[PDB]
């Protein structure tokens, strides 16, 4: 019985691989050959946002490209005014083992989580003039590695129980559960339309989910080690994955296989965070070697280096308006690059 | 700067003051991490995340355990890792030894010391003296090993030698391992962690200075 099912699975996998192999007529590297190279970009730090007394594990911009929230091991979220370096809010946390950090698009809420397996939503714009928990979202069996806000009432969380979940914050219960990963889901990017989302796990597989129907539409597997970061291209038809293999790869949703590999002979360290620009031409990647690299997304060449951290770059973010990049390292500082 | 902006700056400075206050209060305590597979007596050494307080000689200690291949990265700033082994169950002692090899050689613990406790050394005596079980059945190197009751002692030094031998292989001196034979009724376990922590903090102090 099980032998027949496994044989059918092997036939299905061979059919998938043959289906993709027919579509790969001409490589993106060949098509991208005759465009103007971006040259060197020299983005210097403009701000340094000190005040954290531990390693920064996550951060997230606001929708207005003006505010951002950062979580560290001192058990505190700090909401920064990036324009003036002012601290707008300091939110103490019940558990100091935070791994993720989310800012709601409306800006009324923030979310953090980690080894305590609970997503916590904080009400920022309240009477009484303080920040307080509105809801603790329990139900994951493992640690939370990412969480992104669909809206004020919906949030999606990736976890180390091999499962992603979607919640109704008002009711505080798992509306839909996304299952199919075999390793720990490490990164979770939400699509610009908030109808699909792509997740990267420790099994070197990236999976595409439909938020509504709760189904794994496509599975992408090219990496050799765990995927640590994942981010949609602004178009919404592609995404970039960074892994511990010291490699970033660009996957297309419609072609349904890898497009480009961003690797260099020197890089040996794992990739910690991936972000795009507004136009999608640059691919900011945070590395374990305590600096970031700017890859030309189309031509696959290091266009620059962001070297200002004396410990590993753990997070990375780019504003909606595209003015500034943020990097946060285990050195307790986060810098705004332009 | 406008009046609004000046007042916001004042608020930020107050947040800053509270942040250093919390940082000092946090620095006054030492962070640990308790590891061990199961059936090892983890919870009885000092008698999703379970945190336990305890203080010896007016030093705040704060252990954590979980209920590992990826989240160990969080515990890279811990003072020491406490690894626990059940030394009375030789059926799965090699699993424990491989686990120690994994934690010892992990990339993010290259400067983190490990404190070994070999629990149920009170049952190791019974198992060895009874004669029902035999180390040489599992570990061949036992019958050709002699210590540098007698044979229970030689056995328990054999296990310790295995663990310290994995420790020495690639320590490079940046971090070391501290073995301790312990029981369930043994009380002097916070004192062992205290003394080992003094040793580790001495190494760290001598290392911020580029000396050790």
């Amino acid at each position: 019985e099980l032998d027949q099912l496994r044989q059918e699975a092997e036939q299905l996998k061979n059919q998938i691989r043959d289906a993709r192999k027919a579509c790969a007529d001409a490589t993106l590297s060949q098509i991208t050959n005759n465009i103007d190279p971006v040259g060197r970009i020299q983005m210097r730090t403009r701000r340094t946002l000190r005040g954290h007394l531990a390693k920064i594990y996550a951060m997230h911009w606001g929708t207005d490209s003006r505010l951002l929230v950062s979580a560290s091991q001192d058990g505190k979220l700090i909401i920064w005014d990036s324009y003036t370096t002012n601290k707008v809010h300091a939110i103490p946390l019940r558990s100091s083992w935070v791994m993720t950090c989310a800012y709601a698009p409306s800006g009324n809420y923030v979310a953090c989580g980690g080894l305590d397996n609970i997503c916590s939503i904080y009400n920022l714009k309240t009477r009484e003039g303080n920040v307080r928990v509105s809801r603790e979202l329990a139900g994951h069996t493992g640690y939370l590695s990412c969480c992104r806000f669909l809206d004020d009432n919906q949030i999606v969380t990736s976890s180390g129980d091999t499962t992603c979940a979607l919640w109704d914050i008002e009711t505080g219960q798992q509306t839909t559960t996304f299952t199919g990963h075999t390793g720990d889901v490490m990164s979770l990017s939400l699509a610009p339309d908030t109808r699909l989302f792509v997740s990267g796990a420790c099994d070197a597989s990236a999976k595409l989910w439909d938020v509504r129907e709760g189904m794994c539409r496509q599975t992408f597997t090219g990496h050799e080690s765990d995927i640590n970061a994942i981010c949609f291209f602004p178009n919404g038809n592609a995404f970039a994955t960074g892994s511990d293999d010291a490699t970033c790869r660009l996957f297309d949703l419609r072609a349904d296989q890898e497009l480009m590999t961003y690797s260099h002979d020197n890089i040996i360290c794992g990739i910690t965070s991936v972000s795009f620009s507004k136009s999608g031409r640059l691919l900011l990647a945070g590395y374990d070697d305590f600096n970031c690299n700017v890859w030309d997304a189309l031509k696959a060449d290091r266009a620059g280096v962001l070297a200002g951290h004396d410990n590993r770059v753990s997070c990375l973010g780019v504003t909606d308006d595209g003015m500034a990049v943020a990097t946060g390292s285990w050195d307790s500082f986060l810098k705004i690059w332009n | 700067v406008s009046a609004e902006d000046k007042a916001a700056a004042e608020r930020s400075k107050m947040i800053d003051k509270n942040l250093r206050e919390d940082g000092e209060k946090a620095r006054r305590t030492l962070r640990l991490l308790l590891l061990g597979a199961d059936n090892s007596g983890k919870s009885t050494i000092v008698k999703g995340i379970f945190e336990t307080k305890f203080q010896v000689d007016k030093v705040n200690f704060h252990m954590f355990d979980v209920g590992r291949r990826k989240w160990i990265q969080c515990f890279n700033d811990v003072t020491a890792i406490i690894f626990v082994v059940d030394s009375s169950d030789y059926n799965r002692l090699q699993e424990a030894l491989n686990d120690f090899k994994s934690i010892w050689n992990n990339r993010w613990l290259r400067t983190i010391s490990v404190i070994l406790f070999l629990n149920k050394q009170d049952l190791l005596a019974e198992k060895v003296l009874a004669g029902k079980s035999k180390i040489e059945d599992y570990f061949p190197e036992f019958a050709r090993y002699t210590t540098p009751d007698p044979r229970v002692t030689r056995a328990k030094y054999f296990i310790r030698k295995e663990f310290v031998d994995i420790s020495t292989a690639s320590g490079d001196g940046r971090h070391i391992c501290y073995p301790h034979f312990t029981c369930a009724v043994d009380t002097e376990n916070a004192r062992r962690i205290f003394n080992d922590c003094k040793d580790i903090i001495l190494q760290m102090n001598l290392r911020e200075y580029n000396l050790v």
């Epitope: 003006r66 505010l67 005014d81 324009y83 002012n86 707008v88 809010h89 009477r127 009484e128 003039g129 303080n130 | 406008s2 009046a3 609004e4 902006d5 007042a7 916001a8 004042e10 608020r11 107050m14």
Partner: single-chain antibody, 230 residues
């Protein structure tokens, strides 16, 4: 949220009194507190200012030297000690909370004041002292001595509604933003030294005196007041 003021009474000229504001229902230590008085038949006038953490103190020129403002954070109490009281100090002293971070809403909650009876600076102009006008639309204007537009893109104009026999209520902060609870019919617009506050579908419980306050720099100055009567 509740600011309940105390003190008050008939005071002989030259005497001294202390007014006490008792906060309840909000994080009082993280709020900067103002004192604003209103003469029996006049507009609103700023008096004092205690900052969060009591770091910064600002007084009005009229009360500079003979007034003292201080807060007791553990007791959640705000104080106004004032000696050498004069016949120009007869007013209902309102206690005001204000918090200052990015995107905040200062001057959002006012207390029920206590009446005390004693037996350069930017000028705000609100010309239409009384506009007679239900279900229609009205516009209320305000002017300034200097452009209230700061270099950081913020135009610091505020709007207040004083319902009859009630403490004034914030409507608009920074000439565009509606407060927490005001109906969406209100809206403010304007430029430097040119301001307006338009209302649509004017209703009941909606008529009073509309004050425009500047917050560009101290001392904070109000308008005379535009009144809407049905």
């Amino acid at each position: 949220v509740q600011l309940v003021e105390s003190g008050g009474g008939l005071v002989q000229p030259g005497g001294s009194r202390k007014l006490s504001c008792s906060a309840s229902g909000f994080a009082f230590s993280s709020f900067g507190m103002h004192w604003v008085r209103q003469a029996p038949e006049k507009g609103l006038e700023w008096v004092a200012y205690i900052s969060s953490g009591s770091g910064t103190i600002y007084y009005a020129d009229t009360v500079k030297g003979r007034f003292t403002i201080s807060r007791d954070d553990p007791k959640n109490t705000l104080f106004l000690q004032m000696t050498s009281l004069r016949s120009e100090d007869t007013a209902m002293y309102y206690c005001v909370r204000s918090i200052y971070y990015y995107g905040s809403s200062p001057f959002d909650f006012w207390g029920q004041g206590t009446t005390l009876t004693v037996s350069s600076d930017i000028v705000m102009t609100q010309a239409t002292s009384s506009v007679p006008v239900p279900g229609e639309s009205v516009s209320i204007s305000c002017r300034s001595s200097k452009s209230l537009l700061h270099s950081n893109g913020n135009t610091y104009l505020y709007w207040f509604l004083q319902r009859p026999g009630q403490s004034p209520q914030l409507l608009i902060y920074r000439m565009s933003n509606l407060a927490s609870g005001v109906p969406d019919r209100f809206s403010g617009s304007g430029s430097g030294t040119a301001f307006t506050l338009t209302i649509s579908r004017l209703e009941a419980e909606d008529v009073g005196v509309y004050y425009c306050m500047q917050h560009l720099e101290y001392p904070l100055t109000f308008g005379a007041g535009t009144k809407l009567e049905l």
